[PDB]
Amino acid sequence: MTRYIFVTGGVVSSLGKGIASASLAAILEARGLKITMLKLDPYINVDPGTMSPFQHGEVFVTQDGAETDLDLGHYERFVRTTMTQNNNFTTGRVYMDVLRKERRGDYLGATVQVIPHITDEIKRRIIKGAGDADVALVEIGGTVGDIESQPFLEAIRQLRVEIGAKRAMLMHLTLVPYIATAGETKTKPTQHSVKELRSIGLQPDVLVCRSDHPIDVSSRRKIALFTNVEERAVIALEDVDTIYRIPSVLHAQGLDDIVVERFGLECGQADLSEWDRVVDAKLNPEREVTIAMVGKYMELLDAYKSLIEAMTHAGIQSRTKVNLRYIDSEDIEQQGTSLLEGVDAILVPGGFGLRGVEGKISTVQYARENKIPYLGICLGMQVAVIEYARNVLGWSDANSTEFDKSSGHPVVGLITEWQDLGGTMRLGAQECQLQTGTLVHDCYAKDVIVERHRHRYEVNNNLLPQLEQAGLKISGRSGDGALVEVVEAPEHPWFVACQFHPEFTSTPRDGHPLFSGFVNAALKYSG
Amino acid sequence: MTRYIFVTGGVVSSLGKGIASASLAAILEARGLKITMLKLDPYINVDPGTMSPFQHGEVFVTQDGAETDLDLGHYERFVRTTMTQNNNFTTGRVYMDVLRKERRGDYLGATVQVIPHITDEIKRRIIKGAGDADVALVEIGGTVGDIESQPFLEAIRQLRVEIGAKRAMLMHLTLVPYIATAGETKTKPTQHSVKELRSIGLQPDVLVCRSDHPIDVSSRRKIALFTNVEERAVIALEDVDTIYRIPSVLHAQGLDDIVVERFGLECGQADLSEWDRVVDAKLNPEREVTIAMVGKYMELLDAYKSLIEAMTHAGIQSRTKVNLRYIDSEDIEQQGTSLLEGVDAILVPGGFGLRGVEGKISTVQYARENKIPYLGICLGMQVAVIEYARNVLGWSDANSTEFDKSSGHPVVGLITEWQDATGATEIRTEASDLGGTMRLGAQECQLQTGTLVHDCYAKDVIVERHRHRYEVNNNLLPQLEQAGLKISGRSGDGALVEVVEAPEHPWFVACQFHPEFTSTPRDGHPLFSGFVNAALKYSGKA
Amino acid sequence: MTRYIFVTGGVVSSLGKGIASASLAAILEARGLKITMLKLDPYINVDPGTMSPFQHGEVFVTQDGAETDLDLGHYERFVRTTMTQNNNFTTGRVYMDVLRKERRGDYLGATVQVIPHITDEIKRRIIKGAGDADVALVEIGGTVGDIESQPFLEAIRQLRVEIGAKRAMLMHLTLVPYIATAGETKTKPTQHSVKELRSIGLQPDVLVCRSDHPIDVSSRRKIALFTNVEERAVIALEDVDTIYRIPSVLHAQGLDDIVVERFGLECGQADLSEWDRVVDAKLNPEREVTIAMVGKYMELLDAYKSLIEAMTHAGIQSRTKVNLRYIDSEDIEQQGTSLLEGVDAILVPGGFGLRGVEGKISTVQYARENKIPYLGICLGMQVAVIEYARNVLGWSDANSTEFDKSSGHPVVGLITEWQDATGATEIRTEASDLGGTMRLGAQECQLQTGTLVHDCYAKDVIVERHRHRYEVNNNLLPQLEQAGLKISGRSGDGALVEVVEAPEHPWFVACQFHPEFTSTPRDGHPLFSGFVNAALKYSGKA
Structure with a gap:
């Protein structure tokens, strides 16, 4: 009962x-x-x-x-x-x-x-x-x-x-x-x-x-x-000072005792050793790295709670205090990429809306040219692909069907205008096909994984081989390989652009291999 | 504003x-x-x-x-x-x-x-x-x-x-x-x-x-x-004593004066002559009849409010106190039509559900055979058609697809069932999922000249409110027509049967629509007024 | 209206x-x-x-x-x-x-x-x-x-x-x-x-x-x-930052305009020049002193609101930031007067209860002997009289009947106790049930010419607010007077002792009444202003 x-x-x-x-x-x-x-x-x-x-x-x-x-x-x-x-x-x-x-x-x-x-x-x-x-x-x-x-x-x-x-x-x-x-x-x-x-x-x-x-x-x-x-x-x-210490404090007041007494349950005493490890690794770091964060609404209340939690988990699996610098994309647009200098890693997460995407394009360009560990999520992989097409394949007007349709090189677009008309609504968990020898394989240590996705616009396979022979690595595809999932740069210390949102499965007591690898790359850069 | x-x-x-x-x-x-x-x-x-x-x-x-x-x-x-x-x-x-x-x-x-x-x-x-x-x-x-x-x-x-x-x-x-x-x-x-x-x-x-x-x-x-x-x-x-005097009552306490004072309206003084006439003709009747109404839930709270209001309007338009005898159809089924003796008119309105339709069939039979004025509404016309087919044409098992889909003579059914059929029991069953088969709201109705409904409504084309799904089967209608069943009114285009009449009756009108919805106290309703005058004719005479 | x-x-x-x-x-x-x-x-x-x-x-x-x-x-x-x-x-x-x-x-x-x-x-x-x-x-x-x-x-x-x-x-x-x-x-x-x-x-x-x-x-x-x-x-x-700026703040948001608009009042525009002066002289001081206040519950919420307000008024009237050191009397009792070193003036106000009066006695002694300006209020004057009788006249056990009724020298007590007494410890005890012994509210006070209180108040007869039961024993007062204790103010009729002064002190005034109740920010108080100027004189000089 x-x-x-x-x-x-x-x-x-x-x-x-x-x-x-x-x-x-x-x-x-x-x-x-x-x-x-x-x-x-x-x-x-x-x-x-x-x-x-x-x-x-x-x-x-x-x-x-x-x-x-x-x-x-x-x-x-x-x-x-x-x-x-x-x-x-x-x-x-x-x-x-x-x-x-x-x-x-x-x-x-x-x-x-x-x-x-x-x-x-x-x-x-x-x-x-x-x-x-x-x-x-x-x-x-x-x-x-x-x-x-x-x-x-x-x-x-x-x-x-x-x-x-x-x-x-x-x-x-x-x-x-x-x-x-x-x-x-x-x-x-x-x-x-x-x-x-x-x-x-x-x-x-x-x-x-x-x-x-x-x-x-x-x-x-x-x-x-x-x-x-x-x-x-x-x-x-x-x-x-940190939320993970709350279970300790409550335990110190015997509230779990009240629960078990009222419910009449019979089970062993609470063992909070793991949460003690989490709080110890959070309040007592050893290393230190500053990672840039570019988007639309960064300091908005709980706008990116899962992403920040995931990056905290990554920094806590490696005992690093991950300082965060939040820069608005429009600031980069109207001031230049010079605001990004001094950081050790750059992140482009999913953006809310359509404003200020050229700023993210300039951001991924700066990250890849200066060889700074870059991780893109959802919109991150899209802007990474668009920028790679613009600056490697030379398609200056390359863009996506989300934004200005005045684009002769739609490297990312809806399936319907390919091969209105509704929407794909790619939501939920899905199967993945990683590539052997890539950074994604080096992190996940396997070829079959299950992760969650919230996108609708995917990578157009029509222009995919041209980018593939241009050096753009295809380190991951869908559960059947039909669509492009995660990409990497060939001559970059660490550069991963993923369509899915991995921050949703990241937990404080287990971390996340991809975010941990990103943090380790950030430490490798300067730290 | x-x-x-x-x-x-x-x-x-x-x-x-x-x-x-x-x-x-x-x-x-x-x-x-x-x-x-x-x-x-x-x-x-x-x-x-x-x-x-x-x-x-x-x-x-x-x-x-x-x-x-x-x-x-x-x-x-x-x-x-x-x-x-x-x-x-x-x-x-x-x-x-x-x-x-x-x-x-x-x-x-x-x-x-x-x-x-x-x-x-x-x-x-x-x-x-x-x-x-x-x-x-x-x-x-x-x-x-x-x-x-x-x-x-x-x-x-x-x-x-x-x-x-x-x-x-x-x-x-x-x-x-x-x-x-x-x-x-x-x-x-x-x-x-x-x-x-x-x-x-x-x-x-x-x-x-x-x-x-x-x-x-x-x-x-x-x-x-x-x-x-x-x-x-x-x-x-x-x-x-009657609701129509509330406009007087409130007017005696200056409620309208309060409304005008607050809203700052400029309008003439209240003239309640029509409502005074209504209350005087409702509280001081001169004649009196007793009309039977057989149905499903008769004395239920406000279940037939519009129809009882229509009867009251017909009574006041004729200065007659229409006393009403509420009889359950199952009582007629288990006790016989002898509960109907002594009334001057008989009503069969729309039924709430599917129980005791045979009682209403027997009620229609008794009303017709004994020359007692009858008015039917929605289910009333349907049961009138069924009873007429049973007791004149000899189709004993004639029914409606609402109650018996295995009947060999479905004189009443949905349009899709007999729209294009060879004849007899060509009912396609399958519940006829259409949704829009329910005629609802105002629709036109053409009245044949020289019939009781035309005498009452006094116009060739009228407009009335429908709420009904089951219609009269047109594949068997001509036999009923040549059997004496008068078709005194059809739809706005003439495709469907609307109001029917008996051939040798002082007053027998059955309408598919609900006239009680357009009945008002200050204007009455021609159909209900004619029905009440027919009861007045029956009263004393028989 | x-x-x-x-x-x-x-x-x-x-x-x-x-x-x-x-x-x-x-x-x-x-x-x-x-x-x-x-x-x-x-x-x-x-x-x-x-x-x-x-x-x-x-x-x-x-x-x-x-x-x-x-x-x-x-x-x-x-x-x-x-x-x-x-x-x-x-x-x-x-x-x-x-x-x-x-x-x-x-x-x-x-x-x-x-x-x-x-x-x-x-x-x-x-x-x-x-x-x-x-x-x-x-x-x-x-x-x-x-x-x-x-x-x-x-x-x-x-x-x-x-x-x-x-x-x-x-x-x-x-x-x-x-x-x-x-x-x-x-x-x-x-x-x-x-x-x-x-x-x-x-x-x-x-x-x-x-x-x-x-x-x-x-x-x-x-x-x-x-x-x-x-x-x-x-x-x-x-x-x-200070409450006296709230009249400006609200006036900047048109609250008075709202009040005038709603009430339909016709009056001149708001002139907050006095409050602007108050806020400027409170937020931008030029001098600075540190005044000790020893009492019972010093930092308690709004326990001494009027007295701290009076000190603030005295400070603003002199453009001085009166920093205040709150010291518990029991701390002085258990640690000695060494907690008082470094201050420019010492205050002993009315005490809430009966605990730790010996601490205030020692505080008065230290303030007098070291020529540190002292002002006492209610209990302050009482403890000043007790200490002066103890350390000048040699009456070691001199006290008040509030704390010690067995004292052989009750220099402070109720009127009934020594009203008609032979002398010395003729205390009738029995709690002196009178109820009205508590002097409350405004009473007159005559000030002797040429004393500190007369220099401050600048008038021969003043009016001040009392809340106190225990008075100065008149049966032993002449000995104190001839011992050097100055009686600088008496009641409206001269029967009771009101304010006392030390004979060889830069500033030592002890008043039975509470002057802090009539102290205002826009007008100050002469007594508190004189006390603060005495502290200013002590500051730097000693």
């Missing part, structure tokens, strides 16, 4: 609900339990695929082929479980499915409503996502008090009522602010959030207090008495 | 939101203003067509062909305007079209939320429904305090904020209950409802208090003080 | 409700208007006199003799008016007087409720406090959402309804927090606070947003849209 822990937010968003849930999942994984996590989004977008990064950051891609909330990434980085479309869903999906059922007449002339039809669908989806796992952590997006999250709150209240306290808990994340003029932290907004939760029939069992200043014991006593919650169930989670 | 009056419910449902809104609209129409009304349903059903009558009563059919809430009917019966699909919509349709817009990418990578996307959709639909009307009365379904109606309340709050008090009002319907153990009425539930309204930023401007006992002046003063509304803005609307 | 501006708190407490209200009042005073302010405390303590400083800081003493909230002090420091007991009250006093009215039968057998009896009492007290002022700023203690402040919010809602928008505003203080992990400020808690305000029928008219980080324009646009207030009605009030 599966058991559920519900996670909610309070006062203000951006508390770290996903990080705390993933930390708990890692903690219980260290105890031998099989843990799974779910994300419920209180917006009526069917999937986050259409959503821009300005709203809720990046759009994570799972192995089964779903564009999900970025929090799922944290999940895969804290437990070794593969996430599918069942572990993340939205209010819009629920409403659309119930509308389709009602149009199908499955309700037999009944007044379909939020209660009980919508809540029934939400509960069914939650149970389906839980699967066979011993414990499922269901995170609720948004903050309590918003009317968008009320269906989720009612559904979890119904679940708590139906399966009892032995199989359900409420971990509510709330912020205690430090008021500078008063020189102390205030628990009043937390009390207001707890009152809001009580007014909807939900009594939190654990309170996670977030603050940028220490949370003292007297405040914990007051917050425990003013919410009718046992003292040890008041967890203080402050701003930390 | 369009002006809006919002209508809300409180305490409990079934207060009469639609009736009160329609009465106010009638009052304003009597002042010369051009009024329209809208109905917003807080359920996620796309349209009420799939909904059973057990939930929210009948399913009205508009002229443009939409299945809407029954309240729209009230609208057309209180002002002389025509409702379209823009005048009624639901949370389900709003959510579905917003989801389709999001899938189209029309939001350009934006987080679609209840606020402001859903509220924007609701407001746009309100504006589109309002049209060029001087005043639009927007009614909100459900009761205040349910989470289902929160988007609508938020949208009307945004409207109030955006266009100001000179173009917006809130008329909130509440219930003051009479506590028998205390011998007085309590204002506490109304105060709680007003508190719930205040919690969502909505302050009522007019209060319509509903009770089965008189609402005394001290209660009005307390309810105005405890909710910070002027005394004259508290309207007492008790259970009345 | 009196006009009201209401001030409320949100999210968390300690936003600066009183400071913001006083700053707005100062702005309006600069326009020539006659402003007053009121403080409404949502606790059932009758007056804050019994309350400890740990709860809500110091206990202010008004001229008429009332123990009030510290916020009243801010009032007197921002406009040149005097606060009375009508300008501050609590839920406890309202409930107690309503209960007394009910016991008197003044309600004539009526069910006394929160609405309308308590609200009526609160409104009447608001009107009485407002007086003849053109504008009254009524501040509500606590944070919106607590059930303790609901009566006050309901009362101000009733006021808004009754006198209209032309005589009422709501300026709501809220907190926008900077989330370090997100690198931006969140408006969600403010929106929740506004929702809580809307749930009780209160719509804010001005929003004062408080943060430690800049409030960008997009946040202001979002916070105005999501709460349906005009953009110019969103005021950004961040943590400032």
